[PDB]
RNA sequence: UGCGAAUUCGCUU
RNA sequence: UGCGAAUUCGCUU
């Protein structure tokens, strides 16, 4: 049997208005980045009507458009698409084929997949050898569209964070929030015993990547505790030298988290 | 919107 | 060894 390839078209048709931007976020139109997701099927898809997913940035209209049909794919290629599929749900979201598309005309982003398979920060936390002679080097560009994880805690279940702001006015030698430490560098030294080989780097603003499965629609003592918690998490200021960059870029992570909504919608 | 701890209560016959 | 409610605390920077 041949193949059918659909694009999951996303547009932010209604951006979050100021009065609903409680966590005062930056809005992120999906349509601003060319890479996105798609569905590879054996049987064709019945043209579903446009439907909204409610995301951090506003109301995104989802549309399922046909990209190709009646073509073939090699076993090796299917094995790759497949592995990726399992990776998206087991590792990215921690939950026939969902795969990434990208221009060169949208198409299967095999290279991107090859990079995910090749990256050392794809499953957990990679090791590094920063020394005085081989210092951590900060390239701003690597933190524009990025998702990072702390290298120094949660080995078994790494938390992942959107880079929300690069604070260039800050350094690990800037004053630390809590009184018990003079500086960021001291905090990580006294507490985690981490030495920094770069004391000029900017610091990072973060935003948790976690989401509610179901976004098809727009509080107890449980949200009352998860309040202060999730709030403190997003008030955390991170040091790049201490964070690994995730192979999946942020702007696609934003799109990936709409996937469980969309597939639920399509199966009904 | 998590990992845990304690305390006090509701639902069964 | 569940479904919920309230109260008070621990872990992040």
Swiss-Prot record:
Cite the effect that the entry attributes to residue 188 to A. 10-fold decrease in activity
Phosphoserine occurs at which residues? Answer: 221
Q: Consequence of mutating residue 187 to A?
A: 10-fold decrease in activity
The UniProt-reported impact of residue 176 to A is: 2-fold decrease in activity
The entry's localization annotation reads: Cytoplasm; Cytoplasm, Perinuclear region
Limits of the PAZ domain: 111-247
Family, according to the entry, reads as follows: Belongs to the helicase family. Dicer subfamily.
Q: Which disease is it linked to?
A: Pleuropulmonary blastoma: A rare pediatric intrathoracic neoplasm. The tumor arises from the lung, pleura, or both, and appears to be purely mesenchymal in phenotype. It lacks malignant epithelial elements, a feature that distinguishes it from the classic adult-type pulmonary blastoma. It arises during fetal lung development and is often part of an inherited cancer syndrome. The tumor contain both epithelial and mesenchymal cells. Early in tumorigenesis, cysts form in lung airspaces, and these cysts are lined with benign-appearing epithelium. Goiter multinodular 1, with or without Sertoli-Leydig cell tumors: A common disorder characterized by nodular overgrowth of the thyroid gland. Some individuals may also develop Sertoli-Leydig cell tumors, usually of the ovary.
The record's subunit annotation is: Component of the RISC loading complex (RLC), or micro-RNA (miRNA) loading complex (miRLC), which is composed of DICER1, AGO2 and TARBP2; DICER1 and TARBP2 are required to process precursor miRNAs (pre-miRNAs) to mature miRNAs and then load them onto AGO2. Note that the trimeric RLC/miRLC is also referred to as RISC. Interacts with DHX9, AGO1, PIWIL1 and PRKRA. Associates with the 60S ribosome. Interacts with BCDIN3D. Interacts with AGO2, TARBP2, EIF6, MOV10 and RPL7A (60S ribosome subunit); they form a large RNA-induced silencing complex (RISC).
What function does this protein fulfil? Double-stranded RNA (dsRNA) endoribonuclease playing a central role in short dsRNA-mediated post-transcriptional gene silencing. Cleaves naturally occurring long dsRNAs and short hairpin pre-microRNAs (miRNA) into fragments of twenty-one to twenty-three nucleotides with 3' overhang of two nucleotides, producing respectively short interfering RNAs (siRNA) and mature microRNAs. SiRNAs and miRNAs serve as guide to direct the RNA-induced silencing complex (RISC) to complementary RNAs to degrade them or prevent their translation.
Its name, as the record gives it, is Endoribonuclease Dicer
């Amino acid at each position: 049997q041949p193949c059918y390839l659909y694009v999951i078209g996303m547009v932010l048709t209604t951006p979050l208005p100021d009065e609903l931007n409680f966590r005062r976020r930056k809005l992120y139109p999906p349509e601003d980045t060319t890479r996105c997701f798609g569905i590879l099927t054996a049987k064709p898809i019945p043209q579903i009507p446009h439907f909204p997913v409610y995301t951090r940035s506003g109301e995104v209209t989802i549309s399922i458009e046909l990209a190709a049909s009646g073509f073939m794919l090699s076993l090796q290629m299917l094995e790759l698409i497949t592995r990726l599929h399992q990776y998206i749900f087991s590792h990215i979201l921690r939950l026939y084929c969902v795969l990434p598309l990208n221009v060169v005309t949208l198409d299967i982003d095999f290279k991107f997949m090859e990079d995910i398979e090749k990256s050392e920060a794809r499953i957990g936390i990679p090791s590094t050898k920063y020394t005085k002679e081989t210092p951590f080097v900060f390239k701003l560009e690597d933190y524009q569209d990025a998702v990072i994880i702390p290298r120094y805690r949660n080995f078994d279940q790494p938390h992942r964070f959107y880079v929300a702001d690069v604070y260039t006015d800050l350094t690990p030698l800037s004053k630390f929030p809590s009184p018990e430490y003079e500086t960021f560098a001291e905090y990580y030294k006294t507490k985690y015993n981490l030495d920094l080989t770069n004391l000029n780097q900017p610091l990072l603003d973060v935003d948790h990547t976690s989401s509610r499965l179901n976004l098809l629609t727009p509080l107890s003592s449980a949200e009352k505790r998860k309040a202060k918690w999730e709030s403190l998490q997003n008030k955390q200021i991170l040091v790049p030298e201490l964070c690994a960059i995730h192979p999946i870029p942020a702007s696609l992570w934003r799109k990936a988290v709409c996937l469980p909504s969309i597939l639920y919608r399509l199966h009904c």
